[PDB]
Coordinates of C-alpha atoms in Angstrom, one line a residue:
Chain A
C1 CA -31.3 12.1 -21.1
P2 CA -29.3 9.4 -22.6
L3 CA -25.9 11.3 -22.5
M4 CA -24.6 13.1 -19.4
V5 CA -21.3 14.9 -19.0
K6 CA -19.9 15.4 -15.5
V7 CA -16.7 17.6 -15.1
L8 CA -14.6 17.8 -11.9
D9 CA -11.7 20.1 -10.9
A10 CA -8.8 18.2 -9.4
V11 CA -7.2 21.4 -8.3
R12 CA -9.9 22.9 -6.1
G13 CA -11.6 19.6 -5.3
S14 CA -14.9 20.8 -6.8
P15 CA -17.3 20.4 -9.7
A16 CA -16.0 22.3 -12.7
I17 CA -18.8 24.9 -13.0
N18 CA -19.7 26.9 -16.1
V19 CA -17.6 24.8 -18.4
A20 CA -18.6 24.9 -22.1
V21 CA -19.2 21.5 -23.6
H22 CA -19.9 20.9 -27.3
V23 CA -21.2 17.5 -28.5
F24 CA -20.9 16.4 -32.2
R25 CA -22.1 13.4 -34.1
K26 CA -20.1 11.8 -37.0
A27 CA -21.8 12.6 -40.3
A28 CA -21.6 10.8 -43.7
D29 CA -18.8 13.1 -45.0
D30 CA -16.7 12.0 -42.0
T31 CA -17.2 15.6 -40.9
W32 CA -18.4 16.6 -37.5
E33 CA -21.8 18.1 -37.0
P34 CA -23.2 19.9 -33.9
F35 CA -25.4 17.7 -31.8
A36 CA -25.7 19.3 -28.4
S37 CA -24.0 21.8 -26.2
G38 CA -24.2 23.8 -23.0
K39 CA -22.4 24.9 -19.8
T40 CA -21.9 22.7 -16.8
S41 CA -24.1 23.6 -13.8
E42 CA -22.9 24.2 -10.2
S43 CA -22.9 20.4 -9.8
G44 CA -20.5 20.3 -12.7
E45 CA -23.1 18.5 -14.9
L46 CA -24.3 19.2 -18.4
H47 CA -27.7 17.6 -18.4
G48 CA -30.7 16.7 -20.7
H49 CA -28.8 17.1 -24.0
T50 CA -30.9 15.1 -26.4
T51 CA -33.6 12.5 -26.1
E52 CA -33.3 8.8 -26.8
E53 CA -34.9 9.6 -30.2
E54 CA -32.0 11.6 -31.5
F55 CA -29.3 9.8 -29.5
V56 CA -28.8 7.1 -32.2
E57 CA -25.8 4.7 -32.6
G58 CA -22.9 6.5 -34.2
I59 CA -19.6 8.1 -33.4
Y60 CA -19.8 11.0 -31.0
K61 CA -17.3 13.7 -29.9
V62 CA -17.5 15.5 -26.6
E63 CA -15.3 18.6 -26.5
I64 CA -14.8 20.3 -23.1
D65 CA -13.5 23.9 -23.1
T66 CA -10.8 23.3 -20.5
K67 CA -8.6 26.2 -21.5
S68 CA -11.3 28.8 -20.9
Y69 CA -12.1 27.2 -17.5
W70 CA -8.5 27.4 -16.3
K71 CA -8.0 31.0 -17.7
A72 CA -11.1 32.1 -15.7
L73 CA -9.3 30.7 -12.6
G74 CA -6.0 32.4 -13.4
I75 CA -4.3 29.0 -14.0
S76 CA -2.0 28.4 -17.1
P77 CA -3.3 25.2 -18.8
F78 CA -1.6 22.9 -21.3
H79 CA -4.6 21.7 -23.3
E80 CA -6.5 23.6 -25.9
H81 CA -9.5 21.5 -24.8
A82 CA -10.4 18.0 -23.8
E83 CA -12.0 15.7 -26.5
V84 CA -13.8 12.4 -25.9
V85 CA -14.6 10.4 -29.0
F86 CA -16.5 7.2 -28.7
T87 CA -19.0 4.8 -30.4
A88 CA -22.6 4.7 -29.0
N89 CA -23.6 1.1 -29.5
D90 CA -27.3 0.4 -29.2
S91 CA -27.8 -2.8 -27.0
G92 CA -29.6 -2.5 -23.7
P93 CA -31.5 0.8 -23.1
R94 CA -28.4 2.5 -21.8
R95 CA -27.4 5.9 -20.3
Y96 CA -23.9 7.2 -21.0
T97 CA -22.2 9.4 -18.4
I98 CA -19.0 10.9 -19.7
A99 CA -16.9 12.0 -16.7
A100 CA -13.9 14.2 -16.9
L101 CA -11.4 15.1 -14.2
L102 CA -9.4 18.2 -14.9
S103 CA -6.0 19.5 -13.9
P104 CA -4.0 22.2 -15.7
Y105 CA -1.5 19.7 -17.3
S106 CA -3.6 16.5 -17.2
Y107 CA -7.1 15.2 -17.6
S108 CA -8.7 11.9 -17.3
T109 CA -12.0 10.7 -18.8
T110 CA -14.2 7.8 -18.0
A111 CA -17.4 6.4 -19.4
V112 CA -20.0 5.0 -17.1
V113 CA -22.6 3.0 -19.2
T114 CA -25.6 1.9 -17.2
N115 CA -28.9 0.0 -18.0
Chain B
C1 CA 13.4 14.4 -29.5
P2 CA 11.4 17.4 -28.4
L3 CA 8.1 15.4 -28.6
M4 CA 7.9 12.1 -26.9
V5 CA 4.8 10.0 -26.4
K6 CA 4.6 7.3 -23.7
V7 CA 1.6 4.9 -23.4
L8 CA 0.8 2.5 -20.6
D9 CA -1.8 -0.3 -20.3
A10 CA -3.7 0.0 -16.9
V11 CA -5.2 -3.5 -17.3
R12 CA -2.0 -5.5 -17.8
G13 CA 0.4 -3.2 -15.9
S14 CA 2.6 -2.9 -18.9
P15 CA 3.8 -0.5 -21.5
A16 CA 1.2 -0.3 -24.3
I17 CA 3.3 -1.8 -27.2
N18 CA 2.6 -1.2 -30.9
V19 CA 0.1 1.5 -30.4
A20 CA -0.3 3.8 -33.4
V21 CA 0.3 7.5 -32.8
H22 CA -0.5 10.3 -35.3
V23 CA 0.6 13.9 -34.7
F24 CA -1.0 16.8 -36.6
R25 CA -0.1 20.5 -36.7
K26 CA -2.9 23.1 -37.3
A27 CA -2.2 24.9 -40.6
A28 CA -2.9 28.4 -41.7
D29 CA -6.2 27.5 -43.3
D30 CA -7.4 26.0 -39.9
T31 CA -7.1 22.4 -41.0
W32 CA -4.9 19.7 -39.6
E33 CA -1.8 18.8 -41.5
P34 CA 0.2 15.5 -40.8
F35 CA 3.3 16.2 -38.8
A36 CA 4.6 12.8 -37.5
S37 CA 3.4 9.3 -36.8
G38 CA 4.7 6.0 -35.5
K39 CA 4.0 3.0 -33.2
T40 CA 5.1 2.8 -29.6
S41 CA 8.0 0.5 -28.8
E42 CA 8.3 -2.4 -26.4
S43 CA 8.9 0.2 -23.8
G44 CA 5.6 1.9 -24.7
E45 CA 7.4 5.0 -26.1
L46 CA 7.2 6.8 -29.4
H47 CA 10.4 8.8 -30.1
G48 CA 11.9 11.1 -32.7
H49 CA 10.1 11.5 -36.0
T50 CA 10.5 15.2 -35.3
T51 CA 13.5 17.5 -35.1
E52 CA 13.9 20.5 -32.9
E53 CA 13.9 22.7 -36.0
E54 CA 10.8 21.2 -37.5
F55 CA 8.9 21.4 -34.2
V56 CA 8.0 25.1 -34.4
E57 CA 5.3 26.8 -32.3
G58 CA 1.7 26.1 -33.2
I59 CA -1.3 24.0 -32.1
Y60 CA -0.5 20.3 -32.2
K61 CA -2.8 17.3 -32.0
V62 CA -1.6 13.9 -30.8
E63 CA -4.0 11.1 -31.6
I64 CA -3.5 7.7 -30.0
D65 CA -5.1 4.8 -31.7
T66 CA -6.5 3.2 -28.5
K67 CA -9.3 1.3 -30.3
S68 CA -7.0 -0.8 -32.4
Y69 CA -4.9 -1.5 -29.4
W70 CA -7.8 -2.9 -27.3
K71 CA -9.3 -4.8 -30.1
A72 CA -6.0 -6.6 -30.9
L73 CA -6.2 -7.8 -27.3
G74 CA -9.9 -9.1 -27.7
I75 CA -11.4 -6.1 -25.9
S76 CA -14.2 -3.8 -27.1
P77 CA -13.3 -0.4 -25.8
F78 CA -15.5 2.7 -25.3
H79 CA -13.3 5.4 -27.0
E80 CA -12.3 5.6 -30.7
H81 CA -8.9 7.1 -29.9
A82 CA -7.3 9.4 -27.3
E83 CA -6.7 12.9 -28.6
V84 CA -4.3 15.4 -27.0
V85 CA -4.4 19.0 -28.4
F86 CA -2.1 21.7 -27.2
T87 CA -0.1 24.8 -28.1
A88 CA 3.6 24.1 -28.3
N89 CA 6.7 26.3 -27.9
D90 CA 5.0 29.6 -27.8
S91 CA 7.5 30.9 -25.2
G92 CA 10.5 29.3 -26.9
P93 CA 11.4 25.6 -27.4
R94 CA 10.5 23.1 -24.8
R95 CA 10.7 19.2 -24.6
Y96 CA 7.2 17.7 -24.2
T97 CA 6.4 14.2 -23.0
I98 CA 2.8 13.2 -23.5
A99 CA 1.9 10.3 -21.2
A100 CA -1.3 8.3 -21.7
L101 CA -2.7 5.7 -19.3
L102 CA -5.1 3.4 -21.0
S103 CA -8.1 1.4 -19.8
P104 CA -11.0 0.1 -21.9
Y105 CA -13.6 2.6 -20.7
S106 CA -11.1 5.2 -19.4
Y107 CA -7.9 7.0 -20.2
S108 CA -5.8 9.8 -18.8
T109 CA -3.2 11.9 -20.4
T110 CA -0.6 14.1 -18.8
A111 CA 2.0 16.5 -20.3
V112 CA 5.5 16.9 -18.8
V113 CA 7.2 20.0 -20.2
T114 CA 10.9 20.7 -19.4
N115 CA 13.4 23.4 -20.6
Chain C
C1 CA 16.7 -1.2 -9.3
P2 CA 13.8 -3.6 -9.1
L3 CA 11.6 -0.9 -7.5
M4 CA 11.4 2.5 -9.1
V5 CA 9.0 5.3 -8.1
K6 CA 8.2 8.1 -10.5
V7 CA 6.1 11.2 -9.5
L8 CA 4.6 13.9 -11.7
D9 CA 2.9 17.2 -10.8
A10 CA -0.3 17.6 -12.9
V11 CA -0.6 21.3 -12.0
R12 CA 2.8 22.5 -13.2
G13 CA 3.3 19.8 -15.9
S14 CA 6.6 18.8 -14.4
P15 CA 8.3 16.0 -12.5
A16 CA 7.5 16.3 -8.8
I17 CA 11.0 17.1 -7.4
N18 CA 12.1 16.4 -3.8
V19 CA 9.1 14.4 -2.9
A20 CA 9.7 12.1 0.1
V21 CA 9.0 8.4 -0.5
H22 CA 8.9 5.7 2.2
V23 CA 8.7 2.0 1.4
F24 CA 7.6 -0.6 4.0
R25 CA 7.4 -4.4 3.9
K26 CA 4.8 -6.3 5.9
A27 CA 6.6 -8.3 8.6
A28 CA 5.7 -11.7 10.1
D29 CA 3.9 -10.1 13.1
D30 CA 1.6 -8.2 10.6
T31 CA 3.2 -4.8 11.2
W32 CA 5.0 -2.6 8.7
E33 CA 8.8 -2.6 8.8
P34 CA 10.9 0.2 7.1
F35 CA 12.4 -1.1 3.8
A36 CA 13.6 1.9 1.9
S37 CA 13.1 5.7 1.6
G38 CA 14.4 8.6 -0.4
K39 CA 13.4 11.8 -2.2
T40 CA 12.6 12.1 -6.0
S41 CA 15.2 13.6 -8.2
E42 CA 14.9 16.5 -10.6
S43 CA 13.5 14.0 -13.0
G44 CA 10.8 13.1 -10.5
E45 CA 12.3 9.6 -10.0
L46 CA 13.3 7.7 -6.9
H47 CA 15.9 4.9 -7.7
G48 CA 17.8 2.2 -6.0
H49 CA 17.9 2.0 -2.2
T50 CA 16.9 -1.6 -2.9
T51 CA 18.8 -4.6 -4.3
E52 CA 17.4 -7.5 -6.2
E53 CA 18.4 -9.8 -3.4
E54 CA 16.8 -7.7 -0.7
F55 CA 13.6 -7.2 -2.6
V56 CA 12.1 -10.6 -1.8
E57 CA 8.4 -11.5 -2.1
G58 CA 6.0 -10.0 0.3
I59 CA 3.4 -7.2 0.7
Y60 CA 5.0 -3.8 0.2
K61 CA 3.7 -0.3 0.9
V62 CA 4.9 2.8 -1.0
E63 CA 3.9 6.0 0.8
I64 CA 4.4 9.2 -1.1
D65 CA 4.5 12.4 1.0
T66 CA 2.2 14.4 -1.2
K67 CA 1.2 16.8 1.6
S68 CA 4.7 18.2 2.2
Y69 CA 5.1 18.6 -1.5
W70 CA 2.0 20.7 -2.0
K71 CA 2.6 22.8 1.1
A72 CA 6.2 23.7 0.1
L73 CA 4.5 25.1 -3.0
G74 CA 1.9 27.2 -1.1
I75 CA -1.0 24.8 -1.7
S76 CA -3.3 23.2 0.9
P77 CA -4.0 19.7 -0.5
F78 CA -6.8 17.2 0.4
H79 CA -4.7 14.0 1.0
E80 CA -2.1 13.4 3.7
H81 CA -0.1 11.1 1.4
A82 CA -0.5 8.8 -1.5
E83 CA -0.2 5.1 -0.4
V84 CA 0.4 2.2 -2.8
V85 CA 0.1 -1.4 -1.3
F86 CA 0.8 -4.5 -3.3
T87 CA 2.2 -8.0 -3.3
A88 CA 5.6 -8.2 -5.0
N89 CA 7.5 -11.0 -6.7
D90 CA 5.2 -13.8 -5.8
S91 CA 5.8 -15.6 -9.2
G92 CA 9.5 -14.8 -9.3
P93 CA 11.4 -11.5 -9.5
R94 CA 9.9 -8.6 -11.5
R95 CA 10.9 -4.9 -12.0
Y96 CA 8.1 -2.6 -10.7
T97 CA 7.7 1.1 -11.6
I98 CA 5.2 2.8 -9.4
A99 CA 4.0 6.0 -11.2
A100 CA 2.0 8.7 -9.4
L101 CA 0.4 11.7 -10.9
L102 CA -0.4 14.4 -8.4
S103 CA -3.0 17.2 -8.1
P104 CA -4.1 19.0 -5.0
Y105 CA -7.4 17.2 -4.6
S106 CA -6.6 14.1 -6.7
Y107 CA -3.9 11.6 -7.5
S108 CA -3.6 8.5 -9.6
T109 CA -1.1 5.7 -9.3
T110 CA -0.1 3.1 -11.8
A111 CA 2.2 0.0 -11.7
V112 CA 4.3 -1.1 -14.6
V113 CA 5.7 -4.6 -14.0
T114 CA 8.2 -6.1 -16.5
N115 CA 10.2 -9.3 -16.5
Chain D
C1 CA -24.4 12.1 5.0
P2 CA -21.2 14.2 5.2
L3 CA -18.9 11.6 3.6
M4 CA -19.8 9.7 0.4
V5 CA -17.7 7.2 -1.5
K6 CA -18.3 6.6 -5.2
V7 CA -16.4 3.8 -7.0
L8 CA -16.1 3.3 -10.7
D9 CA -14.8 0.4 -12.9
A10 CA -12.6 1.7 -15.8
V11 CA -12.6 -1.8 -17.3
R12 CA -16.3 -2.4 -17.7
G13 CA -17.4 1.2 -17.9
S14 CA -19.7 0.7 -14.9
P15 CA -20.2 1.5 -11.2
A16 CA -18.1 -0.8 -9.1
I17 CA -20.8 -2.7 -7.3
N18 CA -20.5 -4.7 -4.0
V19 CA -17.1 -3.3 -3.2
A20 CA -16.2 -3.3 0.5
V21 CA -15.2 0.1 1.9
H22 CA -13.8 0.6 5.5
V23 CA -13.5 4.1 6.9
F24 CA -11.2 4.8 9.9
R25 CA -10.5 7.9 11.9
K26 CA -7.1 8.8 13.4
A27 CA -7.1 8.3 17.1
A28 CA -4.8 9.7 19.9
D29 CA -2.4 6.8 19.8
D30 CA -1.9 7.5 16.1
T31 CA -3.7 4.2 15.6
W32 CA -6.6 3.7 13.2
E33 CA -10.0 3.1 14.6
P34 CA -13.1 1.9 12.8
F35 CA -15.5 4.7 11.8
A36 CA -17.8 3.4 9.1
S37 CA -18.0 0.7 6.5
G38 CA -20.3 -1.0 4.0
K39 CA -20.6 -2.3 0.4
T40 CA -21.1 0.0 -2.6
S41 CA -24.6 -0.2 -4.1
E42 CA -25.4 -0.8 -7.8
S43 CA -24.8 2.8 -8.4
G44 CA -21.3 2.2 -7.0
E45 CA -22.0 4.4 -3.9
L46 CA -21.4 3.8 -0.3
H47 CA -24.0 6.1 1.3
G48 CA -25.1 7.6 4.7
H49 CA -22.0 6.6 6.6
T50 CA -22.1 8.8 9.7
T51 CA -24.0 12.0 10.5
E52 CA -22.5 15.5 10.8
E53 CA -22.4 14.9 14.5
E54 CA -19.7 12.2 14.4
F55 CA -18.0 13.4 11.3
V56 CA -15.6 15.7 13.2
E57 CA -12.3 17.3 11.9
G58 CA -9.5 14.8 12.0
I59 CA -7.5 12.5 9.8
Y60 CA -9.6 9.9 8.0
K61 CA -8.7 6.8 6.0
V62 CA -10.9 5.3 3.3
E63 CA -9.8 1.7 2.4
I64 CA -11.4 0.2 -0.7
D65 CA -11.2 -3.6 -1.1
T66 CA -10.1 -3.5 -4.8
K67 CA -8.4 -6.8 -4.8
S68 CA -11.7 -8.7 -3.9
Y69 CA -13.6 -6.8 -6.5
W70 CA -11.1 -7.8 -9.3
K71 CA -10.9 -11.4 -8.1
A72 CA -14.7 -11.6 -8.3
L73 CA -14.4 -10.6 -11.9
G74 CA -11.7 -13.0 -12.7
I75 CA -9.2 -10.2 -13.2
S76 CA -5.6 -10.4 -11.7
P77 CA -5.0 -7.1 -9.8
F78 CA -1.9 -5.3 -8.6
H79 CA -3.1 -3.6 -5.5
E80 CA -3.9 -5.1 -2.1
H81 CA -6.5 -2.3 -1.8
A82 CA -6.8 1.4 -2.5
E83 CA -6.3 3.7 0.5
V84 CA -7.4 7.4 0.6
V85 CA -6.0 9.3 3.7
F86 CA -7.1 12.9 4.1
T87 CA -7.8 15.7 6.7
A88 CA -11.4 16.8 7.2
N89 CA -11.1 20.5 7.9
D90 CA -14.3 22.1 9.4
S91 CA -15.0 25.4 7.6
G92 CA -18.2 25.7 5.6
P93 CA -20.9 23.1 6.1
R94 CA -19.3 20.7 3.6
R95 CA -20.0 17.3 2.1
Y96 CA -17.0 15.2 1.0
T97 CA -17.4 12.8 -1.9
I98 CA -14.5 10.5 -2.3
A99 CA -14.4 9.2 -5.9
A100 CA -12.3 6.3 -6.9
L101 CA -11.7 5.0 -10.5
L102 CA -10.4 1.5 -10.6
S103 CA -8.4 -0.5 -13.1
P104 CA -6.4 -3.8 -12.4
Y105 CA -3.0 -2.0 -12.3
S106 CA -4.0 1.5 -11.6
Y107 CA -6.4 3.7 -9.7
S108 CA -7.2 7.2 -9.3
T109 CA -9.0 9.1 -6.5
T110 CA -10.5 12.5 -6.3
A111 CA -12.2 14.5 -3.5
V112 CA -15.1 16.7 -4.4
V113 CA -15.8 19.0 -1.4
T114 CA -19.0 20.9 -1.7
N115 CA -21.0 23.5 0.4

């Protein structure tokens, strides 16, 4: 899998489990189009999305349903969701890991791009 | 100024100056309508393009043009922009400060909401 | 105020109020000597206990009592405190703002240095 | 291994490789005492420190030589190092992962505690 998403909960000090993640690729009309989606596992990971075949260069959007996650915990959140928009540039045979750290009123996201 | 945006550069330890910010409000037809925009000052702050009257409840999107900022500094960043989407004032009027901390392959964003 | 400390609560989306902060300066004998201390205000800021004359170059340590803060809110946090250690003014006098963003199992800290 | 340290570089979008990490445990005299140390691997991880035998409850300090890491890259950093001080509380048979995200003028750290 060329694109991995890892979500952490900065409140409980745990993986963020059962979080819905939708991945989209930018299409000609500059409209978003579904690409991949799933729920994070107990390790907080959303795994084997697409293969290296369909993971072409382009603009991708990763949308993390943070709001539903916090509501499930009884915690009042600020964000409607977390969005990560980036360019996949084809250079070395690279894996992208999108990491997200969640708190009710803040999140951070980091890309780890490895050979 | 019920909506303030503050942007910091985590690489230089400075305010992120001259960063473009666009604010959208979700309209009735579920599309995004332009609400306010500006560039951060020398103190990394974007102030009042918005009044308290005009800043009614709704879903807002703050999009920070992080890519142009890194590129103008000779850096090729991961993300296209930083997006912050939230519901505003739905329990009455609040002041919101959206803080963003920028690195080339990482950003974080935090909301400070005061009465 | 050449040394300012600002602390935010990522759980409540608010300034972190009444947070204890201790600043130490490394002395000649390689131990830490007490330099300044205070509690954050309602705006989450700790201001001037320091003058520009007294804030000479050296290695400084800013220790933020995050544990007492979470516990006073009914929360059992991971960390004992947040520590920030840095060399100050070694190319002439600067203004430093140390920003800390707090969650129970996570914190981040950022330095903004201006001339 | 009951305690893992994972370090990321928010500048290059990579694991932070070859970073020196020193772990200390709080001793009776309220002095720090060496516990474990090593260099992060190419995956940015410092692995199999101690066993569950010697990883008892107590106050631990993880010190990450961020300054040497940035100097090796030609990047001028703010921090002397990053320090993470926490309490290991013995409850479920738990693994602690200490994650650190580094930028020249900022870092964040998160604990992921898992069964």
